[PDB]
Amino acid sequence: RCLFVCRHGERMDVVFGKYWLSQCFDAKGRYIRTNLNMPHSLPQRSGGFRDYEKDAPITVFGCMQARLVGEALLESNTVIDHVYCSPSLRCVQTAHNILKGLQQDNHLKIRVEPGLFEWTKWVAGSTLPAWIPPSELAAANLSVDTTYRPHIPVSKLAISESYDTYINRSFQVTKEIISECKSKGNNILIVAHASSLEACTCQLQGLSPQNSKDFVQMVRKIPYLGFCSCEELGETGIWQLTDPPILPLTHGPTGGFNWRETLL
Amino acid sequence: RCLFVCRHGERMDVVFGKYWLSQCFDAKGRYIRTNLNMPHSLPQRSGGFRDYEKDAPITVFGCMQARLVGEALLESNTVIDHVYCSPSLRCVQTAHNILKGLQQDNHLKIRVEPGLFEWTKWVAGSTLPAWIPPSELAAANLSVDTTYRPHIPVSKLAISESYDTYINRSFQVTKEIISECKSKGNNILIVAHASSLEACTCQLQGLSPQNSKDFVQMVRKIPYLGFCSCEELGETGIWQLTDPPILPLTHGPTGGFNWRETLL
């Protein structure tokens, strides 16, 4: 058995910065694109476009990173039996695009699991992001399973959770995911956050978690689509990180360019 | 009439660094890929793989940058009547992938023009890179016109050329390109180097070249696929840089990730 865990694809807010909404939305709250790295459309949200502030979408390059990983999985003859993701839109969109690369977007249905959301300390303010519910994600042509019953529903998450609580819930939900998939297909894919690669696998392997300082230092080193594999040996039943069946993916930036500022 | 000039797409040597050949070629000089940003194949070269050292290919993401620019030109109904490129492999490959995005890769044939090569001061050592000739570029599936007669052949390029010589030949070749395309289609695309955006357009607009120190500082600000448009104004016949018909393209990096170093 393998549990694959990866980070979401490039997120719009990092590329376009503090006022990114002004580069993506007009005075009427309607989506506009101002750069070729912006998609042709974005879903409508209950609270309007400002719901994107705490829950940004992926970019065109994020979609491509995701598709390339799915294509690499297909090329390696790695069959994915179940796919789970964090409720963050960037995670759902990444999972969908991995499925497209895998040629499984019209077959597998993504299980949206709020227990996979990252440490809530990293959310701005006093409330969680207003996640798009699975019904609406499905309506937005993201291949989500609207019948999936999550292990940790949204209202079981606390905005004030400790590091200990985050790591422990990551372990809990990952065990529950493994248990409900056991003997129903040997490979499980989690599409989530930088912090998920270790949070979901540390205690699974019998290991002691790092302190939160060392943890955060590590989290900052996980790139978009950063991918790991935790395999269950079967001679012992012990889970261990092992080489993924796909190669890493590394690329550089294409920085902002204002031809007027530079060529005049 | 518009003259479009853009920089090539992401280059393999920049992403994978000083020892990139060791990540792309085995002990028998055969191409291997070790990252999902490396293509599935590279052409065989007369001098073998070491000919890539001074003439690196684009990456998978470089291909995608190029395709997205071609797609944007198509979507905006910007018709490209002729495409020229520098003999550098990265420029030829970019031009090919722009054509794919344009859906013109089975219609237009790229005119390889050594006059479009960048300032030769930036070449290592005492000889120019061993460029793949048009016949071989066509054999490597790169939509090149093997019948094109260049204005400045390879052996007309000086290894020790001055800044003034570089700027002046850029002006010369661009005039000859415009003249041979006159009344044969209004839009011309040059796919070349960071330095080409200004070198090809400066004197065309009746402007005085910058000093070489200022020029180099500017060239470092032009990203992959950085795109400009020099338009011939109807009332006067004066050429001037104007807003391109497509949006800019900006994205961030996906940095190197070694799961063993980071998660163990």
UniProtKB/Swiss-Prot annotation, chains A, B:
Tissues/organs with expression: Detected in splenic T-cells and B-cells, total spleen, skeletal muscle, heart, lung, kidney, thymus, brain and liver (at protein level). Highly expressed in brain. Detected in heart, spleen, lung, liver, kidney and testis.
Annotated segments matching region Protein tyrosine phosphatase: 1-264
Superkingdom assignment: Eukaryota
Location relative to the cell: Cytoplasm; Nucleus
Active site residues of this protein: 7, 8 (tele-phosphohistidine intermediate), 193
Reported phenotype of the disruption mutant: Mice display strikingly elevated levels of tyrosine phosphorylated, ubiquitinated proteins following TCR stimulation. They are prothrombotic and have shorter bleeding times, which is attributed to insufficient SYK dephosphorylation in platelets.
Purpose: Interferes with CBL-mediated down-regulation and degradation of receptor-type tyrosine kinases. Promotes accumulation of activated target receptors, such as T-cell receptors and EGFR, on the cell surface. Exhibits tyrosine phosphatase activity toward several substrates including EGFR, FAK, SYK, and ZAP70. Down-regulates proteins that are dually modified by both protein tyrosine phosphorylation and ubiquitination.
Subunit-level organization: Homodimer. Interacts with JAK2 (in vitro). Interacts with CBL. Part of a complex containing CBL and activated EGFR. Interacts with ubiquitin and with mono-ubiquitinated proteins. Interacts with ZAP70 (ubiquitinated form).
Protein name: Ubiquitin-associated and SH3 domain-containing protein B
Organism: Mus musculus
Taxonomic path: Eukaryota, Metazoa, Chordata, Craniata, Vertebrata
Whole-protein residues included: 373 to 636 of 638
